[PDB]
Design an enzyme around this catalytic site. Structure first.
Site, PDB file in Angstrom:
ATOM      1  N   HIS B 261       0.801  -1.221   0.000  1.00  9.01           N
ATOM      2  CA  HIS B 261       0.000   0.000   0.000  1.00  9.01           C
ATOM      3  C   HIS B 261       0.842   1.283   0.000  1.00  9.01           C
ATOM      4  CE1 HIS B 261      -2.699   3.220   1.125  1.00  9.01           C
ATOM      5  NE2 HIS B 261      -1.880   3.472   2.131  1.00  9.01           N
ATOM      6  N   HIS B 266       1.229   5.461  -2.118  1.00  5.21           N
ATOM      7  CA  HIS B 266       1.721   6.749  -1.632  1.00  5.21           C
ATOM      8  C   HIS B 266       3.013   7.258  -2.257  1.00  5.21           C
ATOM      9  CE1 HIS B 266      -1.226   7.492   1.560  1.00  5.21           C
ATOM     10  NE2 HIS B 266      -1.236   6.177   1.718  1.00  5.21           N
ATOM     11  N   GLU B 306      -5.648   9.904   0.408  1.00  4.98           N
ATOM     12  CA  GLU B 306      -6.024   8.495   0.399  1.00  4.98           C
ATOM     13  C   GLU B 306      -6.994   8.097  -0.709  1.00  4.98           C
ATOM     14  OE1 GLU B 306      -4.099   7.680   3.088  1.00  4.98           O
ATOM     15  OE2 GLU B 306      -3.970   5.697   2.159  1.00  4.98           O
ATOM     16  N   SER B 325      -3.622   1.430  -4.829  1.00  6.77           N
ATOM     17  CA  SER B 325      -3.040   0.193  -4.313  1.00  6.77           C
ATOM     18  C   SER B 325      -4.146  -0.839  -4.084  1.00  6.77           C
ATOM     19  CB  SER B 325      -2.273   0.468  -3.014  1.00  6.77           C
ATOM     20  OG  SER B 325      -3.118   1.028  -2.031  1.00  6.77           O
TER      21      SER B 325
END
Ligand SMILES: [Fe+3]
Ligand SMILES: [Fe+3]
Lengths: 403, 403
Positions: B261, B266, B306, B325
Site C-alpha cells: 500500500h 503513496h 487516500e 493500491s
C-alpha cells in the site's frame, strides 16, 4: 600580479563531464535516452533520471561521466538535440569551447573535487611531529565523504593552548569590533559548541549546530581549493573548512587558514540567516561562471566574506572572517588608517588587492541583505546559458533558463 | 460512529511538554533564561537556544521537557512572561487548558511519539511464522531513529510472490486510471528503485530516491499512528510507512496498510513537487491544531491523499493512495457508480465516511496546486495562537504569529 585569493581550478586525471537536460515524457522518450547512452558504451548508473522539479511533464537528467566518454559524447549530444529533441548543456571540468565550466548539481557531487588541494617559511616546517599531525588531518579530509559525520580528533594540550591564545584575544575584542550578527551568535557557540579558551571545538559538533541554524554544514578540507570549488560549495550552504591548527611556535600567525580561522572568523556568521543567504548567493552566482567572473566573485568574496566591514547605523564594525580571526588587523580595519568605500560590486569586482595582512582598503556593506541583493544583481551580468537556484529539500541545484 | 481514519492521540508515561518562545538579546537575557531553568531543577541539555530565524536580534528556545517538570513549569512560564518578558506558548502532549497540542519543532523530534502505535480476523492470525515476521518489522520501526538508514530486510520468495500479484494487476491499470503525476513517476521507481513484480523494494532505497525528488523521506512505522502524529510528519515531508507485507493467503486484501500500500499507493506521488507541497500543507495545518480540526484534516486527508480523484482536463483519474493500491476500488472509483463532488474543504472536512472498501462518494480536485491553496485557506480557520511554516534548510518548523 599581487598574489590574490583567486585560485584557478585544475582537472583531475579523468576530470568531469555532466550533461544538463530535461526530457518531456512522451512514450519511449526515457528509454530512447537511456538506450542512447546504453548504446554508446556508458554505464547507465552514471545516468540518473528524476522528475523535473519545474515542469510536471518532464524528466531531468543527471550524468556523472568523465573525460573517458568524450569521444562518443559529441554524437550523444547531437542525437539528444536533433533526434530526441532536448536543450542540452555540456558541463566540462576542462571548460573548453562551447562547454559550461563544471559544477556540482547535487550536494553529494561536492565529493568529486573536494580533494583537489594545492613550507620552508611555514612555522612547523622543521617539526616532524607537526608535519605528521598535518598528514593526519589531511587524511581525514581526503577520506571524508559528504553525509558522513566529521571524525573527531583529540587535540593535544599544546594545540588547545594555542587555540586559547587566539581565542582569549579575539573574544576580548568582538564586543567592540564585531558586527551584531557575530556577537549575537558567538555566545551560543560558547554555550553549545564547546567554544572555550581551553577547548578546540569538534567540527562535527559545529556542523550540527550550523545546520540547526541555517542548514549550513562543514566539510573538512586538506588545504586550499580552487575559488570555483570553494565558492561553489557555498551554493549548497556547505563550508569547506580546515580542522588542523597552526603551529604553536607562533600562535598569533598563520600563512594559511586553520581551525582558529574557520571557527572564529567564518562559523559564527554562517549561523545567521541573512548572512548565510548572502554567502550562498555568491556561491550560486559562481555555478558555471566563466573563469573571469570566478576571479571577480573571488575578489568580491574577499572584500565581503573575508575582509568586509558592515555599517551598523552610524558606526562601522567588521564581519569579514579574515578580520574576526586576526586581532591585529581587526583593530586596524576600524582605525582611521584604512581607506573605506561603499560596497559597489562593479568596482569591487575589479578591485586590486594582495593577501598581505593589513588591507589598505575595505568595502562597507549597508547590510547582509543589501549585499546579497547586490550580488544577485552582479550575477545577472555573468555569462551563463542559464540561471541557478538551490533546492534545500532535495539539496540539488535547479537550473532555470535566464530570467 | 462509522469507523473512520481518525485516530485520537494518546500520551506516553511522561508525555511531552515544549515551550515556544523567542528572547531579544539584551545583556544577560540568555543567562537569566537558562538560569531560570537551571534554578527550577531542569537539565539544561533539555533547553536549546538558537538564533531566531526571523529576527536578527532574538534567540529562539526549544525545550525537550516532559510531564515530570509540570510542577515548576507554571512558575517558569510566569517568570518568562512577567519578569523576563517573552511571549510563551506551552505545547502539551496532554493538550489541557490553555496549552496548545504538542507537535515536533525539529524533524528529529519525530522520534518522540513515532513508536506510539495502536488480529482474530486478520489473515495470518494463526500463522506463527507470520506473527514472528511482523515482530521483526515492528522491532526495526521501534528501534528506528531519524537520520539512520532504514535497515534492509531480505524478503522471502513467498512475500515477493505476494508483492507481484498486487504489482502486476495495478501496473496493468495505472495507465488508464492513475493521474499523470503517478504515471509520470512510476517508470522511474521501476527503473531506479527496484519496483519490479519479482522484487519488493527496500525502504532505504525508496527514501533516498524520494529525498532526491522532493526531500520527502520515509520512516518505518510498526502500525497505525494517531492522525496528529501521521499528519504532523507530513509537515517535515516525512512519510511514516510500513515495511512488512500482507499475509500471502489473501494477496488481494489487507485490513491494514502494508508495504504494498505504501510503495504503490503513496510513494509515487510523494515524488512530485506539487503533490509533495500539497500533502505537506496538510501536515503544517495540523501542527498544534485542536483535536476537532485534526479529525477534520484527517477526514480531508482521507478524501484527498487516500481516496482523492483528480480532474485532468475533461477526464477524471485517481490519485488517492487508497485507490492506487487497491485494483478493485481503483476501477470502481472511475465507474459510473460513485457519487462525485468538487473539492470544497468546508463540506469535505465534515464529510461522513467509513473505512469499508468501495467508497460511495469521492471528492474531485482541480489540481494538487488548487487543493494545496485550498488547504492553506482551510488552515487559516483553525484555532491556533500562531501560524507555522517549514524550514527545509534546518528542518525545523518556524512558528510565526498569525498572518
Ligand atoms: Fe577564510
Ligand atoms: Fe495510506
Amino acid at each position: 600580479g599581487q598574489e590574490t585569493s583567486y585560485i584557478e581550478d585544475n582537472s583531475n586525471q579523468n576530470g568531469a563531464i555532466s550533461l544538463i537536460f530535461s526530457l518531456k515524457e512522451e512514450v519511449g522518450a526515457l528509454a530512447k535516452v537511456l538506450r542512447l547512452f546504453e548504446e554508446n558504451d556508458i554505464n547507465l548508473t552514471h545516468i540518473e533520471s528524476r522528475p523535473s522539479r519545474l515542469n510536471k511533464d518532464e524528466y531531468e537528467f543527471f550524468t556523472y561521466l568523465d573525460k573517458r566518454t568524450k569521444p562518443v559524447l559529441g554524437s550523444i549530444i547531437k542525437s539528444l538535440r536533433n533526434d530526441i529533441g532536448a536543450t542540452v548543456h555540456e558541463l566540462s571540468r576542462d571548460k573548453e569551447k562551447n562547454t559550461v565550466p563544471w559544477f556540482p548539481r547535487t550536494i553529494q557531487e561536492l565529493d568529486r573535487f573536494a580533494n583537489q588541494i594545492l613550507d620552508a617559511d611555514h612555522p612547523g616546517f622543521k617539526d616532524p611531529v607537526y608535519r605528521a599531525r598535518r598528514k593526519q588531518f589531511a587524511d581525514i579530509a581526503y577520506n571524508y565523504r559528504h553525509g558522513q559525520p566529521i571524525p573527531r580528533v583529540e587535540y593535544t594540550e599544546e594545540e588547545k593552548q594555542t587555540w586559547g591564545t587566539v581565542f582569549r584575544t579575539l573574544k576580548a575584542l568582538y564586543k567592540t569590533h564585531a558586527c551584531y550578527e557575530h556577537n549575537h551568535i558567538f555566545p551560543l557557540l560558547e554555550k553549545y559548541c564547546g567554544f572555550r579558551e581551553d577547548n578546540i571545538p569538534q567540527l562535527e559538533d559545529v556542523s550540527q549546530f550550523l545546520q540547526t541554524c541555517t542548514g549550513f554544514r562543514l566539510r573538512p578540507v586538506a588545504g586550499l581549493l580552487s575559488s570555483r570549488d570553494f565558492l561553489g560549495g557555498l551554493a549548497f550552504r556547505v563550508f569547506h573548512c580546515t580542522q588542523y591548527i597552526r603551529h604553536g611556535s607562533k600562535p598569533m600567525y598563520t600563512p594559511e587558514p586553520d581551525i582558529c580561522h574557520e571557527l572564529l572568523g567564518h562559523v559564527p556568521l554562517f549561523s545567521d540567516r541573512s548572512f548565510a543567504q548572502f554567502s550562498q548567493e555568491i556561491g550560486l552566482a559562481s555555478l558555471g561562471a566563466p573563469d573571469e567572473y570566478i576571479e571577480k566573485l573571488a575578489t568580491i568574496y574577499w572584500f565581503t566574506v573575508e575582509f568586509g566591514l558592515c555599517k551598523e547605523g552610524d558606526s562601522i564594525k567588521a564581519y569579514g572572517a579574515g578580520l574576526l580571526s586576526s586581532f591585529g588587523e581587526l583593530q586596524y580595519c576600524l582605525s582611521d588608517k584604512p581607506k573605506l568605500l561603499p560596497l559597489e560590486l562593479e568596482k569591487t569586482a575589479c578591485q586590486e588587492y594582495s593577501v598581505t595582512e593589513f588591507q589598505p582598503l575595505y568595502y562597507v556593506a549597508e547590510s547582509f541583505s543589501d549585499a546579497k541583493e547586490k550580488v544577485r544583481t552582479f550575477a545577472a551580468t555573468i555569462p551563463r546559458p542559464f540561471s541557478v537556484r538551490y533546492d534545500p529539500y532535495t539539496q540539488r541545484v535547479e537550473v532555470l533558463d535566464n530570467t
